[PDB]
Design an enzyme around this catalytic site. Structure first.
Site, PDB file in Angstrom:
ATOM      1  N   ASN A  41      43.643  53.037  43.275  1.00 25.88           N
ATOM      2  CA  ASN A  41      44.172  52.874  41.911  1.00 25.88           C
ATOM      3  C   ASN A  41      45.120  53.998  41.470  1.00 25.88           C
ATOM      4  O   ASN A  41      45.629  53.964  40.345  1.00 25.88           O
ATOM      5  CB  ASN A  41      43.030  52.722  40.895  1.00 25.88           C
ATOM      6  CG  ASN A  41      42.322  51.386  41.017  1.00 25.88           C
ATOM      7  OD1 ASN A  41      42.929  50.382  41.378  1.00 25.88           O
ATOM      8  ND2 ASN A  41      41.035  51.371  40.727  1.00 25.88           N
ATOM      9  N   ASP A  73      45.047  49.462  36.822  1.00 28.40           N
ATOM     10  CA  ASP A  73      43.830  48.688  36.523  1.00 28.40           C
ATOM     11  C   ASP A  73      42.925  49.210  35.388  1.00 28.40           C
ATOM     12  O   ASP A  73      41.779  48.787  35.293  1.00 28.40           O
ATOM     13  CB  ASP A  73      42.975  48.478  37.784  1.00 28.40           C
ATOM     14  CG  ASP A  73      43.606  47.515  38.780  1.00 28.40           C
ATOM     15  OD1 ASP A  73      44.644  46.890  38.469  1.00 28.40           O
ATOM     16  OD2 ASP A  73      43.036  47.389  39.886  1.00 28.40           O
ATOM     17  N   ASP A 101      36.229  51.470  37.563  1.00 32.72           N
ATOM     18  CA  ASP A 101      36.471  51.249  39.000  1.00 32.72           C
ATOM     19  C   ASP A 101      37.539  52.199  39.527  1.00 32.72           C
ATOM     20  O   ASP A 101      38.357  51.814  40.369  1.00 32.72           O
ATOM     21  CB  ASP A 101      36.938  49.811  39.244  1.00 32.72           C
ATOM     22  CG  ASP A 101      35.989  48.780  38.685  1.00 32.72           C
ATOM     23  OD1 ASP A 101      34.766  48.961  38.820  1.00 32.72           O
ATOM     24  OD2 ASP A 101      36.470  47.771  38.129  1.00 32.72           O
ATOM     25  N   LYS A 105      39.328  54.718  41.752  1.00 30.51           N
ATOM     26  CA  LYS A 105      39.245  55.025  43.169  1.00 30.51           C
ATOM     27  C   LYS A 105      40.650  55.338  43.674  1.00 30.51           C
ATOM     28  O   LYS A 105      41.622  55.026  42.991  1.00 30.51           O
ATOM     29  CB  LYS A 105      38.603  53.861  43.937  1.00 30.51           C
ATOM     30  CG  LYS A 105      39.222  52.500  43.687  1.00 30.51           C
ATOM     31  CD  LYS A 105      38.365  51.367  44.256  1.00 30.51           C
ATOM     32  CE  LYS A 105      38.766  50.032  43.654  1.00 30.51           C
ATOM     33  NZ  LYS A 105      38.227  48.880  44.430  1.00 30.51           N
ATOM     34  N   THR A 163      34.607  50.746  47.372  1.00 33.47           N
ATOM     35  CA  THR A 163      34.115  50.827  45.992  1.00 33.47           C
ATOM     36  C   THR A 163      32.864  51.689  45.817  1.00 33.47           C
ATOM     37  O   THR A 163      32.752  52.418  44.829  1.00 33.47           O
ATOM     38  CB  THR A 163      33.851  49.424  45.398  1.00 33.47           C
ATOM     39  OG1 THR A 163      32.858  48.735  46.173  1.00 33.47           O
ATOM     40  CG2 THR A 163      35.144  48.610  45.365  1.00 33.47           C
TER      41      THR A 163
END
Length: 455
Positions: free
Chosen positions: A135, A151, A130, A132, A170
């Site tokens: 993050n 994360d 995930d 992105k 997302t």
């Protein structure tokens, strides 16, 4: 060991993936930390408890300058608590939009850091999945700060939310193979390629009017360097991007090889900066991108906070309604704390009030507002404050020309990112302002959101 025995909550940092992030302080050592609080009710696990414990134990032993350190891990009946280091430089893209100039050297420095962190985690068999822009945090508020990826390795153990307020952004970054079910660490190279594409052009390579349209483009996997602003960009950068956005993962370049790429090697050197141009149109387009994503997100969080507010308003009223044996003149501090604690105890011990003592202090902040059940109305709108404030600020920030207005076309973009039905928001606009002439001010925008969440 119990989390609240060791840490006290200081401030709410904000919403993250899988839960809220809270600034906490160690009660003995005074050490500040950032704690991600994952509610078991909103997020279900997709792995057995033993494999989660094993990965947690591994993560505590890993160290790298571009990876958020995991210090500690706690679990109770309602929540997982991930205790890590505090970074104060904010999200990368928020720092970038404030810059006046931005070049391929600046992009390459950023991406080298991300790839160095990724390469390290991949050596330890940890995938992000995930990755992105949100993050990517900066260690401090200084210039050219160190990037810390947050994360890593959560995705594997927790199923992502299907609530759109959590899914914002997302779709642009997800690797096609993740959509289809068979994926490995190469998916993190794809996501980084998407991020690099946006750094150098200010626009997502796979775009569309809503989540589904975006996912459709990702799944086909086709993208171009046709936009005017790509003329400013080196062939080496475009070659790296092609290799990172290679469809079949076994043919896609590894993170470690991405580090050895010509573009990274060439543009992450000091003297090259004096003969590289600033990508002004990319800075302009990323400003537009970021503002749009933050407003859409703030809109959904505002609607969510309002629904939560209305739920808790009625619940707390009934708790006091019950506690009161007879009539009014029943505002008793101890009883108010008992009722507020009853409200919390039903859901557990949430992020904003982790302790029994947190509720006592919160009631006191409400009572210090209201002298010595008027208590309910003051208590609730304090919780949504961070949502209302974030909304207006995000509105002002999106309104870069200070016109006071958002256009119909901008609303279509904002609601598209927010996945709000096109025909629905137009109907809501007509109920708010019957005679609108293709634009709304802040109050009107707020009114629309209220109507879009049953208020």
């Amino acid at each position: 060991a119990i989390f609240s025995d060791r840490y006290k909550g200081q401030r709410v940092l904000g919403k993250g993936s899988f839960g809220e992030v809270i600034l906490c302080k160690d009660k003995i050592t005074g050490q500040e930390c950032a704690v991600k609080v994952i509610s078991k009710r909103q997020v279900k696990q997709k792995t057995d408890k033993e494999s989660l414990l094993r990965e947690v134990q591994l993560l505590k032993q890993l160290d790298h300058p571009n990876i958020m350190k995991l210090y500690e891990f706690f679990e109770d009946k309602g929540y997982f608590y991930l205790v890590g280091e505090v970074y104060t430089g904010g999200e990368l893209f928020d720092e970038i939009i404030s810059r006046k100039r931005f070049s391929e050297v600046d992009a390459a420095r950023i991406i080298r850091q991300v790839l160095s962190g990724i390469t390290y985690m991949h050596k330890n068999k940890i995938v992000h999945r995930d990755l992105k822009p949100e993050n990517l945090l900066l260690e401090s508020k200084s210039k050219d700060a160190n990037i810390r990826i947050i994360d890593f390795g959560l995705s594997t153990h927790f199923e992502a939310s299907k609530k759109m307020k959590d899914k914002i952004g997302t779709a642009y970054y997800i690797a096609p193979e993740v959509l289809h079910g068979t994926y490995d660490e190469k998916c993190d190279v794809w996501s980084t390629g998407v991020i690099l594409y946006i750094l150098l052009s200010g626009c997502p390579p796979f775009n569309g009017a809503n989540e589904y349209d975006i996912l459709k483009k990702v799944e086909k996997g086709k993208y171009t360097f046709e936009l005017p602003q790509w003329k400013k960009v080196s062939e080496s950068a475009k070659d790296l991007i092609r290799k990172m956005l290679t469809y079949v993962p076994s043919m896609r370049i590894s993170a470690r090889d991405a580090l050895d790429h010509e573009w990274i090697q060439t543009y992450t050197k000091e003297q090259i900066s004096v003969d590289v141009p600033s990508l002004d149109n990319a800075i302009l387009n990323i400003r537009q991108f970021q503002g749009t994503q933050k407003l859409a997100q703030a809109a959904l969080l505002y609607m969510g906070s309002k629904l939560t507010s209305q739920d808790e308003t009625k619940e707390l009223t009934a708790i006091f309604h019950k506690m009161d044996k007879n009539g009014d003149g029943q505002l008793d501090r101890a009883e108010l704390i008992e009722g507020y604690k009853e409200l919390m105890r039903m859901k557990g011990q949430d992020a904003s009030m982790l302790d029994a003592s947190a509720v006592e202090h919160e009631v006191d902040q409400v009572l210090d507002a209201v002298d010595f059940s008027e208590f309910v109305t003051v208590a609730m709108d304090r919780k949504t404050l961070l949502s209302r404030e974030r909304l207006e600020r995000a509105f002002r920030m999106f309104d870069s020309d200070n016109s006071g207005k958002i256009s119909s076309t901008e609303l279509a973009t904002i609601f598209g990112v927010s996945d709000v039905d096109s025909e629905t928001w137009k109907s809501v606009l007509s109920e708010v302002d019957k005679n609108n002439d293709g634009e709304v001010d802040f109050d009107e925008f707020q009114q629309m959101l209220l109507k879009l969440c049953g208020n």
